[PDB]
Design a protein around this nucleic acid. Structure first.
Length: 51
DNA sequence: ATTGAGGCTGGTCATGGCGCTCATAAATCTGGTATACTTACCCACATTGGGGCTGATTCTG
């Protein structure tokens, strides 16, 4: 049971990582429009990645 | 140098606005979820150090 659920968790983590790497572009595109509101572009894109 | 009274040393009785403590409560402060589709920003000097030559002593075919 332990290693089966470990394999399942690893598969889920891989799929989620793939989704995040695919949608990084959308994150950047959304974060483009808040670059002049007292926050850095890198901070904005990191918050977008978290979201 | 005594004994007859005033001024002044001991404690009575609460008294009274102040401060710490309890409790109520609406305003203030935090966390949370939204499903038509949106995918790569915007000057002049002096000195030391790194990298590319430049021979110049060692070895070679």
């Amino acid at each position: 049971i332990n290693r089966r659920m470990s394999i399942g968790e690893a598969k889920a983590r891989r799929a989620k990582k793939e989704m995040v790497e695919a949608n990084l572009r959308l994150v950047i595109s959304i974060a483009k429009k808040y670059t002049n509101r007292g926050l850095q572009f890198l901070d904005l894109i990191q918050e977008g990645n978290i979201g």
